[PDB]
Amino acid sequence: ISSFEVRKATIDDYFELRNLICDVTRCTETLSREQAEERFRYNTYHPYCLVDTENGRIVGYAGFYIIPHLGRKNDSRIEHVIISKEYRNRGLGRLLCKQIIEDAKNKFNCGRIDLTVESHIAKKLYSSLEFEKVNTEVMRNSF
Amino acid sequence: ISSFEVRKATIDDYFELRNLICDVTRCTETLSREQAEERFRYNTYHPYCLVDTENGRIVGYAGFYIIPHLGRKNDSRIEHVIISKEYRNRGLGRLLCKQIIEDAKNKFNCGRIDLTVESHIAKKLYSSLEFEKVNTEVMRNSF
Ligand SMILES: CC(=O)SCCNC(=O)CCNC(=O)[C@H](O)C(C)(C)COP(=O)(O)OP(=O)(O)OC[C@H]1O[C@@H](n2cnc3c(N)ncnc32)[C@H](O)[C@@H]1OP(=O)(O)O
Ligand SMILES: CC(=O)SCCNC(=O)CCNC(=O)[C@H](O)C(C)(C)COP(=O)(O)OP(=O)(O)OC[C@H]1O[C@@H](n2cnc3c(N)ncnc32)[C@H](O)[C@@H]1OP(=O)(O)O
Ligand SMILES: O=P(O)(O)OC[C@H]1O[C@H](O)[C@H](O)[C@@H](O)[C@@H]1O
């Protein structure tokens, strides 16, 4: 009977969000308030977090990004969806993304959502939400 | 001996860019002045065009997008790279990307640049610019 709420992440959650991402992810930097303010005020970046209502704690995070397109509805992407190791395999990853996916379709009027999966849990998550194989090749230049 | 210049695309170029972008890509819409103005004011979206200095025409386009990150240098992506059928295989595809790639590294302090490619010409261009194949799986939810 544990309550949860999906909500937009904020600057006041920076360090708790950073502890969640950097517990599972490749982190290299701790932002100042001026840098953090900059990244949160990029108007294409929509950080979602998932909160436990019982203890006010953030337990999930997902980064949603608008990719503007000229001549079509904007594209978008989901990167860095993370659920607290404690809370996994309970439907909160699905709960979080479904809120994202509906905001993309009808709140931001996007034409599509793109993502890279590389996981095993992840691929079975997004297939279950109508993400289908895209027949491209990803390439990366790392600095 | 034709001179060219890379510059940031602007609203005043909307219809000339749309004619260029929509020939190889899947366009569905032509934006109003308010929608177009809105998309040009997304502060992660850096539309690059390449102009023929001789005849003021836009002959190339590439979309550069910042992907904000918490705890790391920002990511970025290159989408919609096209050179006019007339101007190809002359080094203008490389010229455009190298300006972007240098602005990503040292103007926006990105950690990496991501992209998806499909045609042969394209993949050989970015491999020659230190893009390496990632071997992930791209998925899409299309609305
Ligand atoms: C940036 C990228 O490339 S995408 C991936 C980014 N982030 C990560 O992988 C972080 C590490 N992993 C996690 O945090 C979580 O496991 C996530 C985010 C992948 C999924 O979050 P969860 O809360 O565990 O997922 P949830 O409980 O909603 O289940 C999602 C679907 O995936 C499946 N699934 C979830 N966990 C597992 C598991 N351990 N084993 C097999 N299947 C699983 C489920 O079948 C589920 O569908 P179902 O409930 O109808 O059966
Ligand atoms: C992220 C994305 O946008 S991917 C989608 C790619 N965009 C498109 O396909 C739109 C249609 N095609 C084009 O607009 C252009 O052909 C581009 C953008 C792919 C390349 O632009 P160009 O101006 O022709 O490239 P440029 O003259 O700089 O040479 C690019 C490299 O690609 C290769 N290349 C170029 N043309 C060819 C060709 N006809 N056949 C084989 N290789 C070629 C070469 O290796 C060349 O390197 P080099 O000059 O050292 O020999
Ligand atoms: O899905 P489309 O809009 O038709 O795009 C086709 C796509 O081909 C490649 O993957 C490029 O990286 C994209 O920038 C381009 O848009």
Residue numbers in the entry:
A (entry chain B), B (entry chain A): 2 to 144
Verbatim from the authors:
GNA1 catalyzes the acetylation of glucosamine-6-phosphate (GlcN6P) to generate N-acetylglucosamine-6-phosphate (GlcNAc6P), which is needed for the biosynthesis of UDP-GlcNAc, a required precursor for both GPI-anchors and N-glycans. Apicomplexan parasites have a hexosamine pathway comparable to other eukaryotic organisms, with the exception of the glucosamine-phosphate N-acetyltransferase (GNA1) enzymatic step that has an independent evolutionary origin and significant differences from nonapicomplexan GNA1s. To further characterize the enzyme and, given our inability to express and purify sufficient amounts of active PfGNA1 (10), we used CpGNA1 as a surrogate, considering that it belongs to the same Apicomplexa-specific GNA1 family and can be purified fairly well with a high yield. CpGNA1 adopts the typical GCN5-related N-acetyltransferase (GNAT) fold previously described in GNA1 enzymes, though with some variations (see below).
Note that Glc6P was used previously as a pseudosubstrate to get insights into GNA1-GlcN6P recognition and catalysis. Remarkably, the highly conserved tyrosine of the active site, also present in CpGNA1 (Tyr127), establishes a hydrogen bond between its hydroxyl group and the thioester sulfur, leading to an increase in the electrophilic character of the carbonyl group of the acetyl-CoA molecule during catalysis. There are 19 residues of CpGNA1 engaged in the recognition of acetyl-CoA and Glc6P. The adenine moiety and the dimethyl group of acetyl-CoA establish CH-π and CH-CH interactions with Ile122 and Ala123/Leu126, respectively.
